[PDB]
């Protein structure tokens, strides 16, 4: 019951690899060998948001594409109006070791978490005129790496204890727990239909789950180091992962294998964040060499650079309407590019 | 953009200015504190280090914060011992602390290990010290090395020689020689002797000298950092 099970697992792995090898006839680069390149992408910094006094660790965009939240190492969450660079809200945190933040799709709440293993839900629309701590979700045994809202009542979080959870905010109890990973889970991304999500962990693997069933659906490998970022394709049938070996990869849900690899010889630092444009043609990745890169998704050629930061680029996001790109850094400044 | 604003936009700008002023005041208040990171070889100073300091405060839990004040100087100690995760993922969050307090129980040299075989707990302490001291994020941060339980070390050293831990050791079996050898071996793991100093101190006095030693080391670190700036402007 020990060696036989291992042999059966090895046979299943060999069968899976053979099945996914038999389904590959031509590469995506071969298919896209005829389409015209996007050319050269030039972006300019239209706005710089100042006011933080430490390293910015996370950011998120509102669904109205105007308000954005940022989290800094000093115990602050700042909610900014991007058009006028006005600070709409400043929220002090009980614990200053914050690693992630999220914006509710309705704009009523914000989320926070970090080294305290707690996800704090803050209510913005209060009759008293202030911002309160609506809820405190506890139960993870490791630091909080990511959190994303499903609706005003549900939120999915990932932690460093190799598990992910789906919570009920009104009760504070863990509704579902996903536990299949081996290393710390670092990233999280919800599908546009919000029925399934993908997580990337330090064991160089990505897993596709099911929110309703609470069980693992698919597993993807190929990276040679920890996976720091993950993002869904706008269609919902693919995703992109950024890792610590200075390489991004595109995986397809239906093909069940890799499609393209985005890497360059003169790129050696790891990727901290990835994002897709509105159409999915451009892939934006933030690096540790202080500047971001814009890649042609369908051709795997670098299309542009975003170099305006003096330190590592930590957070990166694209608006719902795809008009601007907001990038944070380990200096105290956020930049909006157009 | 001061004449084309509406009546409701000038009030929003004023609110933003007030928020920025409060942020500046709180950020200048938070820059006058001394932040120390307490790592230890499992934090062998479970009682003396975190109880001797007169702490006043201003589903397992994660980081633990302790506040105290000594001679009109505020100290915040951060302890991360219950964080059972990859260290290389959250250790860069502490880049910029004033000092790192490393606690080692030198009385735990005869004990081999727990839940393992054929190893020494002292060797694990040295491995952790080597990993932390030569970290890329801590190339400048200074280390205060506390050595605990010196009374038990003297009580036990008579029965068991120090050669059980260090095969190459050759000397007397008294307090001073063994302590000097252990201190030298611990301080010989510093491969970056420049711009980093180790402040060793046998802490088993169980008196008010621990906070005094921390205060002296912190003051020396701050003054060396100030003189490192080398800028009249």
């Amino acid at each position: 019951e020990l060696d036989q099970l291992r042999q059966e697992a090895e046979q299943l792995k060999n069968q899976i690899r053979d099945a996914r090898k038999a389904c590959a006839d031509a590469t995506l680069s071969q298919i896209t060998n005829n389409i015209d390149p996007v050319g050269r992408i030039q972006m300019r910094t239209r706005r710089t948001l100042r006011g933080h006094l430490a390293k910015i660790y996370a950011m998120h965009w509102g669904t109205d594409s105007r308000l954005l939240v940022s989290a800094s190492q000093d115990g602050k969450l700042i909610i900014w109006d991007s058009y006028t660079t006005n600070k709409v809200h400043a929220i002090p945190l009980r614990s200053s070791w914050v690693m992630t933040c999220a914006y509710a799709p309705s704009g009523n709440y914000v989320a926070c978490g970090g080294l305290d293993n707690i996800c704090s839900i803050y209510n913005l629309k209060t009759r008293e005129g202030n911002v309160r701590v609506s809820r405190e979700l506890a139960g993870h045994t490791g630091y909080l790496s990511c959190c994303r809202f499903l609706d005003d009542n549900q939120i999915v979080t990932s932690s460093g204890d190799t598990t992910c959870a789906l919570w009920d905010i009104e009760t504070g109890q863990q509704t579902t727990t996903f536990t299949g990973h081996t290393g710390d889970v670092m990233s999280l991304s919800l599908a546009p239909d919000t029925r399934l999500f993908v997580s990337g962990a330090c064991d160089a693997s990505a897993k596709l789950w099911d929110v309703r069933e609470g069980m693992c659906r698919q597993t993807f490998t190929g990276h040679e180091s920890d996976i720091n970022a993950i993002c869904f394709f706008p269609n919902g049938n693919a995703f992109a992962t950024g890792s610590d070996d200075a390489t991004c990869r595109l995986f397809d849900l239906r093909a069940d294998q890799e499609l393209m690899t985005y890497s360059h010889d003169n790129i050696i630092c790891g990727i901290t964040s990835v994002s897709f444009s509105k159409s999915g043609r451009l892939l934006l990745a933030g690096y540790d060499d202080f500047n971001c890169n814009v890649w042609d998704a369908l051709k795997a050629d670098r299309a542009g650079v975003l170099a305006g930061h003096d330190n590592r680029v930590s957070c990166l996001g694209v608006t719902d309407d795809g008009m601007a790109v907001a990038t944070g850094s380990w200096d105290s400044f956020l930049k909006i590019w157009n | 953009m001061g004449c084309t604003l509406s009546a409701e936009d000038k009030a929003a700008v004023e609110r933003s200015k007030m928020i920025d002023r409060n942020l500046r005041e709180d950020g200048e208040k938070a820059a006058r504190e001394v932040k120390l990171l307490l790592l230890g070889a499992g934090e062998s100073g479970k009682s003396t280090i975190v109880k001797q300091m007169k702490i006043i405060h201003e589903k397992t839990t994660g980081i633990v914060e302790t506040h105290f004040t000594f001679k009109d100087l505020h100290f915040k100690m951060f302890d991360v011992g219950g964080q059972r995760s990859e260290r290389k993922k959250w250790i860069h969050c502490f880049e910029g602390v004033t000092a790192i307090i490393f606690c080692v129980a030198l009385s735990d040299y005869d004990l081999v290990l727990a839940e393992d075989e054929e190893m020494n707990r002292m060797h694990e302490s040295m491995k952790l010290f080597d990993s932390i001291c030569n970290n890329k994020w801590f190339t400048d941060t200074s280390i205060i090395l506390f050595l605990n339980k010196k009374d038990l070390f003297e009580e036990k050293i008579k029965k068991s020689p120090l050669t059980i831990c260090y095969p190459e050791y050759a000397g007397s079996n008294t307090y001073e020689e063994a302590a000097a050898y252990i201190q030298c071996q611990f301080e010989d793991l510093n491969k970056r002797k420049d711009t980093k100093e180790i402040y060793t101190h046998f802490t088993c006095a169980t008196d008010t000298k621990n906070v005094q030693f921390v205060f002296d080391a912190v003051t020396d670190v701050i003054i060396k950092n100030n003189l490192k700036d080398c800028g009249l402007f």
Epitope: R66, V88, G129, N130 | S6, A11, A12, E14, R15
Partner: single-chain antibody
Framework: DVQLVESGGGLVQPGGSRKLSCSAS????????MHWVRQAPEKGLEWVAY????????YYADTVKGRFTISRDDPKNTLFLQMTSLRSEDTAMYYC??????????????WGQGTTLTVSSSDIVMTQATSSVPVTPGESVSISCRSS???????????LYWFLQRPGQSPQLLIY???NLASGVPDRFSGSGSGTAFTLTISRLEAEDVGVYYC?????????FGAGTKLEL
Amino acid sequence: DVQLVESGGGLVQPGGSRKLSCSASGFAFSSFGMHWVRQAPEKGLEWVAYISSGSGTIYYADTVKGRFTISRDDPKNTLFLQMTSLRSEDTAMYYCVRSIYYYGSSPFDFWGQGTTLTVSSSDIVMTQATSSVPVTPGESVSISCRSSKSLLHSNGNTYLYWFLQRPGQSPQLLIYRMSNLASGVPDRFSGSGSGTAFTLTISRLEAEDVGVYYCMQHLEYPLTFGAGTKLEL
């Protein structure tokens, strides 16, 4: 439990002085700008004074400028209005209104209860032509408001507010910025219109809806109210 309670009103001989106080309880008083608004007997509403958050901006109406002073005490949560040389046209009921200004806020959302002062014996003009209409329950009604200047700003905001005052009650905010429904307001009410022509529509009229409806502009100071349209039956 948001509460604003006014006090200090009585009978004053002409040429005297009087102080009105407004005490707030149940909300963050320091974060709200505050207004004093008066209503003459059997007449409409009239804006009097405004003080910002942090007291950095103060505005008065030309009728009361020079003779009236407005102030706030934040630690005590109080708002003061000092009036000197009280003429015979200052006999009215005074309301203490709170308003907060940021992107997406709802100003003028809470009104006080009012205190009665009885003394012994260019600006944008808003027109509410219809003084009163007969209304049957269950029908649909429309109230029209007109302006002498275009309230549509260059930033895309139309600064028109609809308030309702029930008999023997304080005014309440129905609609802000011509389209947004205030919290606690049923879905029956709606607002629409274009520059210098706005409409407030009530569908399936029910009880506790009779009273006076006012349209106010917030494009630039001074803030001017309408004459008020009365719904009866």
